[PDB]
Coordinates of C-alpha atoms in Angstrom, one line a residue:
Chain A
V1 CA -60.0 34.6 318.6
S2 CA -61.2 33.1 315.4
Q3 CA -60.7 35.3 312.4
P4 CA -60.4 34.3 308.7
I5 CA -57.2 35.9 307.5
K6 CA -53.9 34.1 307.0
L7 CA -52.4 36.3 304.3
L8 CA -52.4 40.0 303.9
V9 CA -51.3 41.3 300.4
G10 CA -50.6 44.9 299.6
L11 CA -50.9 45.6 295.9
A12 CA -48.1 47.8 294.2
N13 CA -46.0 48.6 291.3
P14 CA -42.3 48.2 292.1
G15 CA -39.5 50.7 292.4
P16 CA -39.0 54.2 293.6
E17 CA -40.9 56.0 290.9
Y18 CA -44.2 54.2 291.8
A19 CA -43.8 54.0 295.6
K20 CA -45.7 57.2 296.4
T21 CA -48.4 56.7 293.6
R22 CA -52.0 56.2 294.7
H23 CA -52.1 52.7 293.1
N24 CA -49.6 51.6 295.8
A25 CA -51.9 52.4 298.7
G26 CA -52.3 48.7 299.7
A27 CA -48.5 48.3 300.0
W28 CA -48.4 51.3 302.2
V29 CA -50.6 49.4 304.7
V30 CA -48.4 46.3 304.7
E31 CA -45.2 48.4 305.0
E32 CA -46.6 50.2 308.0
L33 CA -47.9 47.0 309.6
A34 CA -44.5 45.2 309.2
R35 CA -42.6 48.3 310.5
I36 CA -44.7 48.4 313.6
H37 CA -44.1 44.7 314.1
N38 CA -40.4 45.0 313.5
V39 CA -40.2 42.6 310.6
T40 CA -38.2 43.4 307.4
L41 CA -39.8 41.8 304.4
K42 CA -37.5 39.4 302.5
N43 CA -37.3 39.2 298.7
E44 CA -38.4 35.7 297.6
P45 CA -38.1 35.3 293.9
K46 CA -40.3 32.1 294.0
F47 CA -43.1 34.4 295.2
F48 CA -42.4 37.3 292.9
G49 CA -42.4 39.6 295.9
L50 CA -41.4 40.6 299.4
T51 CA -42.7 38.6 302.3
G52 CA -42.7 38.2 306.0
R53 CA -44.5 36.5 308.9
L54 CA -45.9 38.8 311.6
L55 CA -46.9 37.7 315.1
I56 CA -49.9 39.9 316.0
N57 CA -52.1 39.3 319.1
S58 CA -50.3 36.5 318.6
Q59 CA -51.9 35.1 315.5
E60 CA -49.5 34.4 312.6
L61 CA -50.1 36.7 309.7
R62 CA -48.1 36.3 306.5
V63 CA -47.7 39.4 304.4
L64 CA -46.8 40.0 300.9
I65 CA -46.0 42.9 298.6
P66 CA -45.6 41.7 295.0
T67 CA -42.6 43.0 292.9
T68 CA -44.3 42.0 289.6
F69 CA -46.0 44.5 287.4
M70 CA -49.3 45.4 289.1
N71 CA -51.1 43.5 286.3
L72 CA -49.2 40.3 287.3
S73 CA -50.0 40.6 291.1
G74 CA -51.7 37.2 290.9
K75 CA -48.5 35.4 290.1
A76 CA -47.2 36.4 293.5
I77 CA -50.3 35.8 295.5
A78 CA -51.0 32.4 293.9
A79 CA -47.4 31.3 294.2
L80 CA -47.3 32.2 297.9
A81 CA -50.8 31.0 298.8
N82 CA -50.2 27.7 297.1
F83 CA -46.9 27.1 298.9
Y84 CA -48.5 27.9 302.3
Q85 CA -51.7 26.1 301.6
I86 CA -53.8 29.2 301.9
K87 CA -57.3 29.5 300.2
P88 CA -58.7 32.6 298.6
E89 CA -61.1 33.1 301.5
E90 CA -58.2 33.3 303.9
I91 CA -56.5 36.1 301.9
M92 CA -57.1 39.9 302.4
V93 CA -55.8 42.1 299.6
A94 CA -55.3 45.8 300.4
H95 CA -55.7 48.1 297.5
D96 CA -56.5 51.6 296.4
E97 CA -60.3 52.1 295.9
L98 CA -61.6 54.6 293.4
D99 CA -65.2 54.4 294.8
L100 CA -64.2 55.7 298.2
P101 CA -62.8 59.1 299.1
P102 CA -59.4 59.8 300.5
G103 CA -59.4 59.3 304.3
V104 CA -61.9 56.3 304.2
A105 CA -61.2 52.6 304.2
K106 CA -63.4 49.6 304.3
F107 CA -63.2 45.8 304.7
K108 CA -65.2 43.7 302.2
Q109 CA -65.4 40.1 301.1
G110 CA -65.8 39.6 297.4
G111 CA -66.7 41.9 294.6
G112 CA -65.5 42.8 291.2
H113 CA -62.1 44.2 290.3
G114 CA -63.6 47.6 289.5
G115 CA -61.1 47.9 286.6
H116 CA -58.1 47.7 289.0
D117 CA -55.5 45.8 287.0
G118 CA -54.0 44.1 290.2
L119 CA -57.4 42.9 291.4
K120 CA -58.2 41.6 287.9
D121 CA -55.1 39.5 287.8
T122 CA -55.6 38.3 291.3
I123 CA -59.1 37.0 290.5
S124 CA -57.7 35.2 287.5
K125 CA -54.7 33.5 289.2
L126 CA -56.9 32.4 292.1
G127 CA -58.9 30.4 289.6
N128 CA -61.6 33.0 289.1
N129 CA -62.4 33.0 292.8
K130 CA -63.5 36.5 293.9
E131 CA -64.1 35.5 297.4
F132 CA -61.0 36.9 298.9
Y133 CA -61.2 39.7 301.5
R134 CA -60.3 43.3 300.5
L135 CA -59.0 46.3 302.4
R136 CA -60.3 49.1 300.2
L137 CA -58.3 52.3 300.8
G138 CA -60.2 55.2 299.3
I139 CA -58.3 57.4 296.8
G140 CA -61.1 59.2 295.1
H141 CA -61.6 59.2 291.3
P142 CA -61.1 61.6 288.4
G143 CA -63.9 63.2 286.5
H144 CA -63.5 60.9 283.4
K145 CA -63.0 57.2 283.1
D146 CA -60.3 57.5 280.4
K147 CA -58.2 59.4 283.0
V148 CA -58.3 56.6 285.7
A149 CA -55.0 55.0 284.8
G150 CA -53.2 58.4 284.9
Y151 CA -54.9 59.2 288.1
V152 CA -54.0 56.1 290.1
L153 CA -50.4 56.3 288.7
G154 CA -50.1 59.9 290.0
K155 CA -49.0 61.1 293.4
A156 CA -51.8 62.7 295.5
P157 CA -51.5 66.4 296.4
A158 CA -50.2 67.0 300.0
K159 CA -53.6 67.5 301.6
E160 CA -55.1 64.5 300.0
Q161 CA -52.0 62.5 301.0
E162 CA -52.6 63.4 304.6
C163 CA -56.0 61.9 304.5
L164 CA -54.6 58.8 302.8
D165 CA -51.9 58.4 305.4
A166 CA -54.5 58.8 308.2
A167 CA -56.6 56.0 306.6
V168 CA -53.5 53.8 306.3
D169 CA -52.6 54.2 309.9
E170 CA -56.2 53.5 311.1
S171 CA -56.4 50.4 308.7
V172 CA -53.2 49.2 310.4
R173 CA -54.8 49.6 313.8
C174 CA -58.0 47.8 312.7
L175 CA -55.9 44.9 311.3
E176 CA -54.3 44.6 314.8
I177 CA -57.9 44.6 316.2
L178 CA -58.9 42.0 313.6
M179 CA -56.3 39.7 315.1
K180 CA -57.4 40.4 318.8
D181 CA -61.2 40.8 318.6
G182 CA -62.1 39.4 315.2
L183 CA -63.5 40.7 311.9
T184 CA -66.9 42.2 313.1
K185 CA -65.3 44.3 315.8
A186 CA -62.5 45.4 313.4
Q187 CA -65.0 46.3 310.7
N188 CA -67.3 48.2 313.1
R189 CA -64.3 50.3 314.1
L190 CA -62.9 50.9 310.6
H191 CA -66.2 51.8 308.9
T192 CA -66.8 54.7 311.3
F193 CA -63.5 56.3 310.6
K194 CA -63.2 59.2 308.2
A195 CA -60.1 61.3 308.3
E196 CA -61.1 64.9 307.2
Chain B
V1 CA -45.5 47.7 249.8
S2 CA -42.0 49.0 250.7
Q3 CA -43.7 51.6 253.1
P4 CA -46.4 49.6 255.0
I5 CA -47.0 51.9 258.0
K6 CA -50.2 53.9 258.7
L7 CA -50.1 54.0 262.5
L8 CA -47.2 54.6 264.9
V9 CA -47.9 53.8 268.5
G10 CA -45.5 54.7 271.4
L11 CA -46.1 52.6 274.5
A12 CA -46.0 54.2 278.0
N13 CA -47.6 54.1 281.3
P14 CA -49.6 57.3 281.9
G15 CA -48.0 58.2 285.1
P16 CA -46.5 59.4 287.3
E17 CA -45.9 62.5 285.3
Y18 CA -42.6 63.2 287.2
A19 CA -40.7 60.3 285.9
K20 CA -39.0 59.3 282.6
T21 CA -39.0 55.5 283.2
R22 CA -37.6 53.0 280.8
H23 CA -40.9 51.4 280.0
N24 CA -42.1 54.7 278.4
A25 CA -39.3 54.7 275.7
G26 CA -41.7 54.2 272.8
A27 CA -43.7 57.3 273.7
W28 CA -40.5 59.3 273.7
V29 CA -40.1 58.5 270.1
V30 CA -43.7 59.5 269.2
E31 CA -43.4 62.7 271.3
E32 CA -40.2 63.8 269.5
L33 CA -41.4 62.9 265.9
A34 CA -44.6 64.9 266.7
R35 CA -42.6 67.8 268.1
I36 CA -40.4 68.1 265.0
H37 CA -43.4 67.9 262.7
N38 CA -45.5 70.4 264.6
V39 CA -48.2 68.0 265.7
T40 CA -50.0 68.5 269.0
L41 CA -50.9 65.2 270.6
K42 CA -54.5 65.6 271.8
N43 CA -56.5 63.4 274.2
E44 CA -59.0 61.3 272.3
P45 CA -61.0 59.3 274.9
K46 CA -62.6 57.0 272.3
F47 CA -59.1 55.7 271.5
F48 CA -58.0 55.7 275.2
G49 CA -54.9 57.8 274.4
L50 CA -53.2 60.8 272.9
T51 CA -53.5 61.0 269.2
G52 CA -52.1 63.0 266.2
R53 CA -51.8 62.9 262.4
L54 CA -48.7 63.7 260.4
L55 CA -48.1 63.9 256.7
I56 CA -44.6 63.1 255.7
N57 CA -43.8 62.7 252.0
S58 CA -47.6 62.8 251.4
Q59 CA -48.1 59.7 253.5
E60 CA -50.5 60.0 256.2
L61 CA -49.1 58.7 259.5
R62 CA -51.4 58.6 262.5
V63 CA -49.8 58.5 266.0
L64 CA -51.0 57.2 269.3
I65 CA -49.7 57.1 272.8
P66 CA -52.2 55.1 274.9
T67 CA -53.2 56.4 278.3
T68 CA -54.5 53.0 279.4
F69 CA -52.7 50.9 281.9
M70 CA -49.7 49.5 279.9
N71 CA -51.4 46.0 279.8
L72 CA -54.4 47.5 278.2
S73 CA -52.4 49.3 275.4
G74 CA -54.0 46.9 272.8
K75 CA -57.4 48.3 273.7
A76 CA -56.3 51.8 272.5
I77 CA -54.5 50.5 269.5
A78 CA -57.4 48.2 268.3
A79 CA -59.9 51.1 268.9
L80 CA -58.0 53.4 266.6
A81 CA -57.0 50.9 264.1
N82 CA -60.6 49.7 263.8
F83 CA -61.9 53.2 263.5
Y84 CA -59.5 54.1 260.6
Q85 CA -59.5 50.5 259.1
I86 CA -55.8 50.0 259.6
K87 CA -54.6 46.4 259.5
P88 CA -52.0 45.0 262.0
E89 CA -49.3 44.8 259.3
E90 CA -49.8 48.6 258.8
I91 CA -49.0 49.4 262.5
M92 CA -45.6 50.0 264.1
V93 CA -45.3 49.9 267.8
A94 CA -42.3 51.7 269.4
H95 CA -41.4 50.1 272.7
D96 CA -38.6 49.5 275.2
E97 CA -36.6 46.4 274.3
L98 CA -34.8 44.4 277.0
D99 CA -32.9 42.5 274.3
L100 CA -30.8 45.5 273.1
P101 CA -28.6 47.8 275.0
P102 CA -29.2 51.4 275.7
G103 CA -28.0 53.3 272.6
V104 CA -29.2 50.7 270.1
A105 CA -32.5 50.4 268.3
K106 CA -34.0 48.2 265.5
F107 CA -37.1 47.7 263.3
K108 CA -38.7 44.3 263.0
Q109 CA -41.9 42.7 261.9
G110 CA -43.5 40.1 264.2
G111 CA -42.0 38.3 267.2
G112 CA -43.1 37.5 270.6
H113 CA -43.9 39.9 273.4
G114 CA -40.7 39.1 275.3
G115 CA -42.5 39.7 278.6
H116 CA -43.5 43.2 277.7
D117 CA -47.0 43.7 279.1
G118 CA -47.9 46.2 276.4
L119 CA -46.8 44.0 273.5
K120 CA -48.6 41.1 275.0
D121 CA -51.9 43.0 275.1
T122 CA -51.3 44.4 271.7
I123 CA -50.9 40.9 270.1
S124 CA -54.1 39.8 272.0
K125 CA -56.3 42.7 271.0
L126 CA -55.2 42.7 267.4
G127 CA -56.9 39.2 267.2
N128 CA -53.8 37.2 268.4
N129 CA -51.7 38.7 265.6
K130 CA -48.0 39.2 266.0
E131 CA -47.3 40.6 262.5
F132 CA -47.3 44.3 263.4
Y133 CA -44.0 46.1 263.1
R134 CA -41.9 47.1 266.1
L135 CA -39.4 49.8 266.7
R136 CA -37.3 48.2 269.5
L137 CA -35.6 50.8 271.6
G138 CA -32.9 49.1 273.6
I139 CA -33.0 49.5 277.3
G140 CA -30.7 46.6 278.4
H141 CA -31.6 43.6 280.5
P142 CA -30.8 43.5 284.2
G143 CA -29.4 39.9 284.2
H144 CA -32.2 38.3 286.3
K145 CA -35.8 37.6 285.8
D146 CA -36.9 38.5 289.3
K147 CA -36.6 42.3 289.1
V148 CA -37.5 42.9 285.4
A149 CA -40.7 44.9 286.3
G150 CA -38.7 47.0 288.8
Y151 CA -36.0 47.6 286.1
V152 CA -38.4 48.7 283.3
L153 CA -40.4 50.9 285.8
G154 CA -37.1 52.5 286.9
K155 CA -35.4 55.7 285.7
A156 CA -32.2 55.0 283.9
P157 CA -29.1 56.6 285.3
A158 CA -28.1 60.0 283.6
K159 CA -25.4 58.5 281.4
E160 CA -27.6 55.6 280.2
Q161 CA -30.4 58.1 279.5
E162 CA -28.1 60.0 277.2
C163 CA -27.7 56.8 275.2
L164 CA -31.5 56.3 275.2
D165 CA -32.2 59.9 274.1
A166 CA -29.6 59.4 271.4
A167 CA -31.4 56.3 270.1
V168 CA -34.7 58.2 270.3
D169 CA -33.2 60.9 268.0
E170 CA -31.9 58.3 265.5
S171 CA -35.1 56.4 265.6
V172 CA -37.0 59.6 264.7
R173 CA -34.6 60.2 261.7
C174 CA -35.1 56.6 260.5
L175 CA -38.9 56.9 260.9
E176 CA -38.6 60.0 258.6
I177 CA -36.5 57.9 256.2
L178 CA -39.0 55.0 256.3
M179 CA -41.8 57.4 255.1
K180 CA -39.6 58.8 252.3
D181 CA -37.5 55.8 251.1
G182 CA -39.3 52.7 252.7
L183 CA -38.5 50.1 255.4
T184 CA -35.4 48.5 254.0
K185 CA -33.4 51.7 253.7
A186 CA -34.7 52.9 257.1
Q187 CA -33.4 49.6 258.6
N188 CA -30.1 49.8 256.9
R189 CA -29.4 53.2 258.6
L190 CA -31.0 52.3 262.1
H191 CA -29.4 48.9 262.5
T192 CA -25.8 50.2 262.1
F193 CA -26.4 52.9 264.7
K194 CA -24.9 52.9 268.2
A195 CA -25.0 56.0 270.3
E196 CA -21.6 57.7 270.9

């Protein structure tokens, strides 16, 4: 089946202290996808991150979790995409999404960064090309804008984390469906899911 | 001239709240100076951070810990410095310094960002001006470029943290000395210090 995605990126800050923070939600998806496919990601300094190649339905999907600062995610994504000759429209970036609630996830093509430091850098390093795909993992949002960075760098409370974990798992399933049945069918499934 | 400083900024990421990570070293200095001087740091959304005002030897010293993403620290700094008409040469930015070991600290004017995302943004948002002062709190350098973000976003081991905390204490004393006796004398004390 024809489907557009050659590279799946999961945005993150590195290390143990950031691993369970909301702003690492996209990495959670890639980690669970790789685990289910029995591939351990390898550190590749030239790509500023951890990478692997998955065989799913049995398309080849490269995956990446940058080990840069979140605000330098684009260095990883560009370095890898250039090496493998991948264009922005063939990249899906999974990330935490303030404008969706915990337990929801959506696919989208294009859009702004929404103030997400990793998406901002990604757009920049891909030559101001916004037309990469996104896997938007809802995290909710705080009451006040000035509290957004503290929010995304916090750990969700247990109940909220259950919703997020559910949406991660269903996003993984829909990525597997993307590789079997294509984007429209994957999206139709994902966009009816709501954990609660 | 000998006491140029009107604003002391302590860089840090604003979460997770559970975690004393190396890249928050500068905020530790501002928090301890504030504690000793009975200043409560208060959220001030128009400056994108926690703020205070001290009076030490009749010199007003405003303090800021940005609550932006680290790579937007200069947005907070410039917001406050513009509001109070403080020039860049009147600002001292306390920050983790890869180029000194744990237990050592130094004052300097100008210099590059050395890869520090907060310093980089600060130079930019101050109108591409490096000539603010720095309080460099040594955190050591991991010996390879690849995992620098992971290193600064890590928690120092308990022993190393004792060295850090000792450098924070000495840095607070030398900030007090700067406000009383001026920068040359404050340097003469700080630069001969090593934690024991």
